[PDB]
Amino acid sequence: STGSATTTPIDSLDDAYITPVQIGTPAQTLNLDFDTGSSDLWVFSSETTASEVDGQTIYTPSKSTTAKLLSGATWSISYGDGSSSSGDVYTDTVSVGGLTVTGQAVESAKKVSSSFTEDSTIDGLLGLAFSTLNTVSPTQQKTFFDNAKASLDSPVFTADLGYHAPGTYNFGFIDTTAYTGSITYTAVSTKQGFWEWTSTGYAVGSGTFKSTSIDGIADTGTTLLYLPATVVSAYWAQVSGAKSSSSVGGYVFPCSATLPSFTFGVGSARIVIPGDYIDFGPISTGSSSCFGGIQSSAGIGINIFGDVALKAAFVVFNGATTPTLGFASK
């Protein structure tokens, strides 16, 4: 089997992407944030504290003839950005782009943090990291991909995120028309539960490539590119007037600037992030200070190849017995 679904930016900055997902019988379609940095499929629901729901579409398990309470199971998750959610668990039928999994754990939120409430466009998350990170207790549950894997034509999914435009998540096949040149594959460590890999270096604009190992995670659920402070300083030093602002929470730059590109290495291959992908616009409405899309990972504890990086590539998440990651230009 295979599946193919369009993923759409939630706003004009590509702060996140939503993908429609069918849950239950009859189908209830929710728009979920596919997150290769976590491993829970959780939704706003009829059980979510009423004051914490503000415009989201909810899953109502009592209206699904295939929903079953997973007795005694609870979940609770905290994300890198400080947001969180928790609740209980149902199993139900879940379909993405024509690919159906029966008996998928659907984690129903009883509580969500303010950042989730305030984002009316995201109805929940669909985790695509390794199932070892799933938070369901006392019986850990499998991700949608892990459940689908054996049925897929090939045990892979791909992320093709757009810049200020829709893109595609495919399951079970590689669309050879969706990228240019060849796909370069690189080793993955699953030791921390992430799609963790080592970039071979970077360049700023038309500058020379610096060969240096940068360990990090491919994370579709993180907006920006978080890299070591040395790398990030070298980038912003090429933008007149750019500075790190502790009050704002990162590097800012004059909105009048033209940003240089940023290149990262994948083995001997190179992925080029155009300068415009690094512009996240005014820090507040009407400001001439703009927020940068490349930020320091210092004090995160891990480097994160988030959407800024991934949307410059066609990315293969290869879930074979020995997982790997592939990157192509597009």
Query: How many Å apart are CA 214 and CA 218, to the nearest integer?
Result: 12
Is CATH 2.40.70.10 the right assignment for the domain spanning 175-330? yes
- Inter-residue contact 107 to 41 (CB < 8 Å): yes
**Extended beta strands in 67-224, E state:** 68-78, 84-96, 99-112, 124-127, 156-160, 167-171, 184-187, 196-204, 210-218
Beta bridge partners of 41: 126
Q: Which of 160-199 are b and which e, b meaning 16 or more Cβ less than 10 Å from the residue's Cβ?
A: bbbeeeebbbbbbbbeeeebeeebbbbebeeeebbbbbbb
Domain coordinates in residue numbering, the chain: 5-174, 175-330
CATH of 5-174, one of 2.40.70.10, 3.40.50.300, 3.40.1080.10, 3.40.50.620: 2.40.70.10
Query: How many Å apart are CA 144 and CA 311, to the nearest integer?
Result: 22
Query: How many Å apart are CA 308 and CA 40, to the nearest integer?
Result: 23
User: What resolution does the deposited structure have, in angstroms?
Assistant: 1.2
Q: Which residues contact 204 (CB under 8 A, 6 or more apart)?
A: 234, 235, 238, 260, 261, 262, 263
Please state the separation of Cα 301 from the chain's center in Å: 18
Beta bridge partners of 245: 250
5-174 and 175-330 share one CATH topology?
yes
Please state the separation of Cα 268 from the chain's center in Å: 25
Burial class of residue 10 in the structure, from the number of CB atoms within 10 Å of its CB (0-12 exposed, 13-18 middle, 19+ buried) = middle
- Inter-residue contact 217 to 303 (CB < 8 Å): yes
- Per the document, the length of the chain is 330
Task: Spell out the alpha helix ranges (H) of the chain.
Answer: 114-117, 144-148, 229-236, 307-310
Query: Catalytic residue positions?
Result: 35, 199
Burial class of residue 74 in the structure, from the number of CB atoms within 10 Å of its CB (0-12 exposed, 13-18 middle, 19+ buried) = middle
